[PDB]
Design a protein around this ligand. Sequence first.
Ligand SMILES: N[C@@H](CCCC(=O)O)C(=O)O
Lengths: 509, 508, 508, 508
Amino acid sequence: TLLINQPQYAWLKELGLREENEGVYNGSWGGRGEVITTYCPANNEPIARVRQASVADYEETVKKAREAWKIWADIPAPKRGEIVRQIGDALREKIQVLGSLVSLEMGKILVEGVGEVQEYVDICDYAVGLSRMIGGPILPSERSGHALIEQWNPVGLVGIITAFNFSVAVYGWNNAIAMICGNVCLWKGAPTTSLISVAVTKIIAKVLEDNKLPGAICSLTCGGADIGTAMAKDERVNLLSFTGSTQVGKQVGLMVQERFGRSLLELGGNNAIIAFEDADLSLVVPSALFAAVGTAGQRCTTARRLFIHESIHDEVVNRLKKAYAQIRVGNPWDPNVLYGPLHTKQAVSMFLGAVEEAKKEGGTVVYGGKVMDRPGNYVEPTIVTGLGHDASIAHTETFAPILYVFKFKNEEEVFAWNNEVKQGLSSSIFTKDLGRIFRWLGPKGSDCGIVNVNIPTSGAEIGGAFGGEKHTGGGRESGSDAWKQYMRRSTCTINYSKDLPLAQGIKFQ
Amino acid sequence: TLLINQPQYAWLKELGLREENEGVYNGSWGGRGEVITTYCPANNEPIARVRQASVADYEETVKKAREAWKIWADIPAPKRGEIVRQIGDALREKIQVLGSLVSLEMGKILVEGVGEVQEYVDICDYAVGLSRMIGGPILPSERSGHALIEQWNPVGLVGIITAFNFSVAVYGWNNAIAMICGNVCLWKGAPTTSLISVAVTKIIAKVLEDNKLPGAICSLTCGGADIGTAMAKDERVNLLSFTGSTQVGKQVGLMVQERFGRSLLELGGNNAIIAFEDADLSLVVPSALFAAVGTAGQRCTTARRLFIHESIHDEVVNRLKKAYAQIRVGNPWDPNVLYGPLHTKQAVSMFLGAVEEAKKEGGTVVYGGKVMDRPGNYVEPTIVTGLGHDASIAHTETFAPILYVFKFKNEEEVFAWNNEVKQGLSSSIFTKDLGRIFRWLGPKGSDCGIVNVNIPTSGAEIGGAFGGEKHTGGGRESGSDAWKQYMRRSTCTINYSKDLPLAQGIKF
Amino acid sequence: TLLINQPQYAWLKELGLREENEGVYNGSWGGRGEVITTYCPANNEPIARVRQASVADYEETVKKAREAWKIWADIPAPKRGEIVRQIGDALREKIQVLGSLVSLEMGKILVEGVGEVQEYVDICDYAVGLSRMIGGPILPSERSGHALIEQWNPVGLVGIITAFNFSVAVYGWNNAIAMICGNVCLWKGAPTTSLISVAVTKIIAKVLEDNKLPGAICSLTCGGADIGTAMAKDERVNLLSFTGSTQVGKQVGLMVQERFGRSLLELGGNNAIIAFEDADLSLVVPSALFAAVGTAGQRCTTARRLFIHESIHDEVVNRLKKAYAQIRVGNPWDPNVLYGPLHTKQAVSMFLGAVEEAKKEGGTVVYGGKVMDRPGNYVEPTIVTGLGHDASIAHTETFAPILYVFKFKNEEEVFAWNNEVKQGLSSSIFTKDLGRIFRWLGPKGSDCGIVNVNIPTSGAEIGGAFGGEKHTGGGRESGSDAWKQYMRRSTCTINYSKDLPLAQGIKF
Amino acid sequence: TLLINQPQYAWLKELGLREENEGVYNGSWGGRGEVITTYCPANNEPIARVRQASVADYEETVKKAREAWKIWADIPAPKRGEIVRQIGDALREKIQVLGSLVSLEMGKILVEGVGEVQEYVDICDYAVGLSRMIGGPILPSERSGHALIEQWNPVGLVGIITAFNFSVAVYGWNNAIAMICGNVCLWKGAPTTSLISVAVTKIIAKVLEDNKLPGAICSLTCGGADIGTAMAKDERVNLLSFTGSTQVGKQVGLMVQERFGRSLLELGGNNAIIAFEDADLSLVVPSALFAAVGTAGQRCTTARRLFIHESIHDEVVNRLKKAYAQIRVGNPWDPNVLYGPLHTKQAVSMFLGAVEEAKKEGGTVVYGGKVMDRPGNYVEPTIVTGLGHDASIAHTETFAPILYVFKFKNEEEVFAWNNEVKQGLSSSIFTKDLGRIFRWLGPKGSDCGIVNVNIPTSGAEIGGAFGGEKHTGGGRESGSDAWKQYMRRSTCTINYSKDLPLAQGIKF
Ligand SMILES: N[C@@H](CCCC(=O)O)C(=O)O
């Protein structure tokens, strides 16, 4: 009955998955907690079983991870980079079967699932060179015979808590950067993506073991909210990188702050696209479609608000409706499929209430709005007109493919409206006006961490830092100097002279 | 009876201070809150009075500041830097008399009063060049016809809460850096240094108004915990830089995180000096003395733990005694005075309490330990030997000049003892050994934000970033790229090409 | 008969100038070369005299600067920045009178002459903060127990050769940066701006002396080609920064190369403005006018080629013409004057000769062309239409206010036409097309060092690096990491571990 | 009779090598020039043949690389990095055979041949991440409505001329970096390592072909001096990276400077190790030997001068004689050999002349000095004592394993003696003294590009920039921000507003 027992999914064994899999890795495999069965969201069938971490399994893994950091922190960064280079190779070798699992257990289409593995591969290749670059400047001291040096050192144990929607890429950014920076990692993923977590962990575990490194450098404790809470409350977890809901993340932030820990928070988005009157509509319509319906509207960067200038509102909405009607729906791993299921049945329920709540706040469904009558967690991609930009349902983040559309007239109000929500992840304007683009990029422009021009809200690459402002939680991942979040800075002054001159010219005798 | 009314203290008027001073500034001066009188700790006499912020004053000040920000954010950063350059010059012209006020109301000696003002002068000169510099890389996008740029923009309103012990320098770092970064500022100082806040604000306000700029760019609301708590809970304060105790820092951190604000935390220190058997003892002894007794032991970077290798312990303690006994004690504004009073009478009592608790836990007062028999808040700089490095009184930061001295034997144990406490601000070892030095700077070395070699734990320069790890709160100020904390990063992709994404089967 | 002896020019004494001035400074003032007279190009009247450097003067000055470097290089860079801050202040207090000297001896209008002093002031402000920042990274070694750090150290003696047209700003970018970088400087300016060189040097000398530093840190040796050639051949000149013609800089570049020195060459320009059909013409015409006739067209960044899309070629030419006929000509120090004289009498012959050659090559003079019938080296600002874009006269750099106007149709060809010249200094396009702008900035866009959009080719700011490509020599001055050209990089690996090398079979 | 025709060398065919090979690659393979046979320095047996480039081949190849550049420079940098990554993989896969060919044709030991290829693999992995990072800052303009951006674009065609000794690593450093930076490459290697060039080029071509990229992106034209001179004078070669002798490099710099090109010069070294009295002799003796005898003393980083403090000179020399006696000499593929032959018989004759000259100049040969009695270019590693530190032969860079030993007493003189030679590549001190070490790294320390502590003069890592000062030519390769030499900077100002404010506030 389990998909992994059927001959058509024999490919799952290419990842080393079996019937029932150990969900805890710390150099050894195990798991004394509850056994969980994950399901294919396209057809509600069970895939395989994962043994979750008990509290004793969590405890022993933290201790072994900390034992392993002592070895790992002594490995020169570029040699740590070499390990990350081999992780990238191992991922590359299995990119098609691993992306296939992502489509199967999580539900995004195959191009996006292989693309998610490619991000992990790409951030590995990026971290290899960065492992020869991380550090600070040597600075000119004002004091004779003194050296002034900025040093960076690992923070220790990096806990990484991931959500269902990027069960691979988010861990990848975190793991590749944390590791070249000399940290050990502990991973607790979403329970509905446990097999993905195990399959990735197996890939990394073999690379550590092939290099005779302690496996707990990249530990795994599959589990639910109690393992996540324990990590937030645990003083041995020096940095906690949490990706998830704003609601749960706020509590994670408070528990880490209570113990003077470090948190890296990637929380909810309520991302706006703005199309001005001079916008290229050949760019607006398909950009908005991909950004809205891509991954069935379940990215943190999904376009959820569409502001259109008064003069072109109707035309964009009509053209958007024409294009929605051609979205090809089916199993996420079949060719030509563009749109698959939601990840859980609860997500369908949240979708339905969102749509009803938008009707009750005076919105009009111009496209979609219904559960699709088919096996799996499938809902129609939905467009809502007529809500005021300050409608409660438009300010709520709903992880479902609902696009609230608004009119506007001038730039100043619509910039404000982009900025008025609690979230602050991604944002995008479509315009040709040079002055407006640099204003959008300026202090009176977009307040988000991602600020795009003539591309949708899901336009990001690993070269820059990834994260948001306000209720998105402030953290950054991937590129630029985001590695500094995974290390502690020391300002170091070395008197190599025989004298003791004091800063700011203070004479003390 | 008020010091400001006696002719020998007429110089306070050079700072614009009067008998009763307004404690709120937001373009205009006011203060409808509680009136307090601050006192000179060298003689327990009242100096002058400050009318503090009421709630309505606070409300009006935040509103005015956020309005001023709309103007200030539109000023090009280099021109903002020119304003900060004039603030530099305006502190330069007042450095002697402002430093005397710091000596009079806070109580540190004159060279440290002027040196603290010199730090604000220094960070101003630094920020002027930085104002032509702040920003991010243009990065190579992986997409044809796309630009990738990292932009930095101001967070808006920077609230600044400071403590009594560095009533000028801390605000100075935060103010100069926040200003060039395009933010407006709201300052709440320690009530016992309210005259210092007012005088500093007067200097800034004049520069602002001389440049026909709204003075709320650098607002002041004098007040106690109610004002500080209001700032920590106020969503209009985008960044709260808080320097203070660890207990209150933790509550401010939680309040800011509750509202998804930004906090910058600079909390307590329990800093250690370690002296290895190979150390130049002529660097060790005066470094320890200055780091210990400087500012009467009231810096967050004060050395409170002295680890000496077993082989040189007694000689170093004996040499430190001989040096403690030669310290010149007096009024802190008198030149050539080296040792002033504690900031309050409570601190004198808390000093005696810790000496007693030290003795109870088995320590020996080898020097000092007693209040001095003179007017003011004077206690003897104290050296305790014989405690275990884990004794509880030595793990509780007490703003009093008590230096706890421990023995050690080997590198590894004393590195761990340095790291064992809750705080993580400054640290220093004294050694000639090349490998030990780099290990101290490495991942198995010191865990503090300031990691020093052959100098005391105190007296950092402004070119590097300042702050601590662990219970010190993790914030940074002053140098390096600490400015990034005062701004918001954005990663910006610009599609400048006429290319449409693949139709992916949809007829458009 | 000297202007400095007339009552109205008595303001010259505020700069310490006299009838005859020493043109050598190395801590002492001297000069045993030929005495030269400088003339005011506004009326061809002699201003005053300067004694130039003999061979002996040059030798003694180099030795003294090389001795001063021993002291200066040991001064911490942030303290070297404090000196530069004071130079900036000394220039601030003299900006009106020094700018007036620039107008009187060089001949640009007063706002540009003051604005040129401003640039030196600005780069000082910048350099102060830069003196806290310069350095390189500490990198992770792949070797256990090893440090990898990039050190920067001064090159030693920076020869600075400048031209007549920016007799203050160019020296200042070089000076403020070389100084904070730990170098000593030797200046040889243009002979016809000797008083400016002497006056700048007096301002800097006072600061140095006031700070009890050897004056040779900023040495001056006024002289002609013999001194400049000596510097290019002198192994004691570790870096030679040369701003001048392409023909001379090429020989300077080879002489420095022949002795394995470092050189920084800022040579000619042939800068183009390209206005596309969608350009804001209210931006195009005033931008073109300023860039072409500002400084009487004697800037290295002056616009000399103006490409206009054939749809708007005549309209732009007509509006530009009516705009030319409204320029206020007169004495450059008189108010509201926007167009002063050429710098030399010889420059007027080159202008007349270029105009005829332009007519010779088929171009039509649609405005100007003639010498103005008045005292001084006054020529009419000129506009020439009808040349092929590749006319020989339009590819030669001529320091005259002649604008060569061309038509174009396609973006590809006109980008190529911008790039086809030998020089690669400045360039500007005027358009609203987002894609064309980023293509202009990209690998198939401008090949110049300054690449502008909707602003003239002249008037950069200090935050960025300044300089050109191709026959402009490749040097960079002022901003970004231009400072690195004044320092030598070292890549330093420190073994601090007691680990011994792999014996590899040998018994040690 | 050719080694590639013998069964024991059949591994050569795994590199695509045949009896007669084409020495030109530009997308197609060819070679109309002279046919050269390269020989094995271990036994003077012919390996294979290569058809060198005619001038027509060079001419055709430049045109193809320039056309290929139009395509390559349009490809985003991170995608260019993806090519380089595959090149590292294709090298990684062939490391043993390519290492073995390096040992066979050049003559170094197999572990060093393999290690030289690892450097290329390493710089590939480094450049891949660099491909997402290159660029400049976005700076805050002093002007409202204005953007300030620093851009970097490729230079175009980067000609790479290498010498025999690092026939793979140097090319790789220049190639990986120039490629991610959007340039195309044309390689002329040393004729005596033509097979190495063809083999490396075959490996790269396959990667380019599989990625459907024009092969001329990595062009090769095997040839002698006439081809190198062509590149030095060729305006279409935008950057010429030249590794080789100072004599030729000086001429290369002059030719490139004459045409206003860009040159990157990596010339000779006369590197010193200094062992102070406090040095760990357990570190000094092996570090000296491997730095002096490694690669038969044919590195540019080879230790040629050993300064020893008087107190320890005799001991170190005696321990270094007893260590030289254990160097295992044999064929460079023989397992467990440390020391192979010199590259040419002319290197043998230079060696002999240097020894005899050192003897005729007063030195004593305490070890070696003679040619070995076996087939190949084998000479005893040599140690010369009693020679004054400025003896003429000591300052001559002779590319052979001779180590000149000198005594010293004081830190200052021996630093001066390190710095007194014309070359400025690598330098090393062995000491435990902390103050001495930072002085060595400071402005009065080593003048070299590479400044090491307690490690030998060779063996730096790709993370840092590599190159020297003075007569070493100033170029930097590989790490840090060396990539900037392969790109042109542009300072770009964008006015996105309808206003036009001039810099420095100049009102026109
Ligand atoms: N510049 C001073 C600042 C101390 C600040 C503090 O004690 O809270 C120092 O480095 O000790």
